[PDB]
Design a protein around this ligand. Structure first.
Ligand SMILES: C[N+](C)(C)CCCN1C(=O)[C@@H]2[C@H](C1=O)[C@H](c1coc(-c3ccc(Cl)s3)n1)N1CCC[C@@H]21
Ligand code: NA
Ligand code: NA
Lengths: 233, 54
């Protein structure tokens, strides 16, 4: 996350961290239930093997509430394409269930039509993660969040050097130096409605981070709400 | 009555019928007797920040 702020205790409890063959974070995810994590399909190619950490806010401190879970099943979207990042979505089933607690709780899955009319029409959503704090920088050791404006699709397409499919949306700022970044990849974009946070996006890609005239690109979760339900059984 | 004005007074999901609105809630909540509010069924309902240390 470039700009934004550190997540306060209890404020980002749906954040998951995928950890590679080093206990190093390389992507985010979103807690959906005791057994399921939502992430980006493109993250699955970035480490041969990985585990999921929940409850972490500071990767350099053993607070005591963190827990690591192994992955039992990876359910990648069967139309995911590395060339365009179209269909950039996956669900992970964990081998053991998450115990919800301080800093560990699921984000809500909204009903589709209402999400389209009511969530995607809000001014902003929130993105979070442990990703880089500037494009050429290093990952944050502390969990950050950022309020990102929804950006209309026509503006989105004109801004981009690459195709923006209807499975994607833009969020963020034209010139203000705030954005998601590498390492936030796969993590949550949620939208608040009367103090309840609903899953609306997955951090997918960008042309650099916080560049002038570029936006962050997110997987459009409304397009996949039925797919998520099926994937979770 | 309409979902476009104050979300039909629903706490969460709103859908319009011929004359009325119908409210509903995400899993882990029960729609209240008033037909509008969503009541959590457990201590870590989806979408809520964990601010009351139990
Ligand atoms: C056109 N398309 C193929 C989708 C571009 C993919 C570009 N891209 C990569 O190749 C990945 C990923 C990314 O977005 C990642 C990256 C850079 O910036 C970001 C983000 C910026 C804003 C976001 Cl929202 S995600 N992700 N790159 C740095 C490390 C891996 C590589
Ligand atoms: Na920690
Ligand atoms: Na920008």
């Amino acid at each position: 996350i470039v700009g934004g702020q550190e997540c306060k205790d209890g404020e980002c409890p749906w954040q998951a961290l995928l950890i590679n063959e080093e206990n190093e974070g390389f992507c985010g995810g979103t807690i959906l239930s005791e057994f399921y994590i939502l992430t980006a399909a493109h993250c699955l190619y970035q480490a041969k093997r990985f585990k999921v950490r929940v409850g972490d806010r500071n990767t350099e401190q053993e607070e005591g509430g963190e827990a690591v879970h192994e992955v039992e099943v990876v359910i990648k979207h069967n139309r995911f394409t590395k060339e365009t990042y179209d269909f950039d979505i996956a669900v992970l089933r964990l081998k053991t269930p998450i115990t919800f607690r301080m800093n560990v709780a699921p984000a809500c899955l909204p009903e589709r039509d209402w999400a389209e009319s009511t969530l995607m029409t809000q001014k902003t959503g929130i993105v979070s993660g442990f990703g880089r704090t500037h494009e050429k920088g290093e990952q944050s050791t502390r969990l950050k969040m950022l309020e990102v404006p929804y950006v209309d699709r026509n503006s989105c397409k004109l801004s981009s050097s690459f195709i923006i499919t209807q499975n994607m949306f833009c969020a963020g700022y034209d010139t203000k130096q705030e954005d998601a970044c590498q390492g936030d990849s796969g993590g949550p974009h949620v939208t608040r409605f009367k103090d309840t946070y609903f899953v609306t996006g997955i951090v997918s890609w960008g042309e650099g981070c916080a560049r002038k005239g570029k936006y962050g690109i997110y997987t459009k979760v409304t397009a996949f709400l039925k797919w998520i339900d099926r994937s979770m059984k | 009555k309409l979902c476009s004005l104050d979300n039909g007074d629903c706490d969460q999901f709103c859908h319009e019928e011929q004359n009325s609105v119908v409210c509903s809630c995400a899993r882990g909540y029960t729609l209240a007797d008033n037909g509008k509010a969503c009541i959590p069924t457990g201590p870590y309902p989806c979408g809520k920040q964990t601010l009351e240390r139990r």
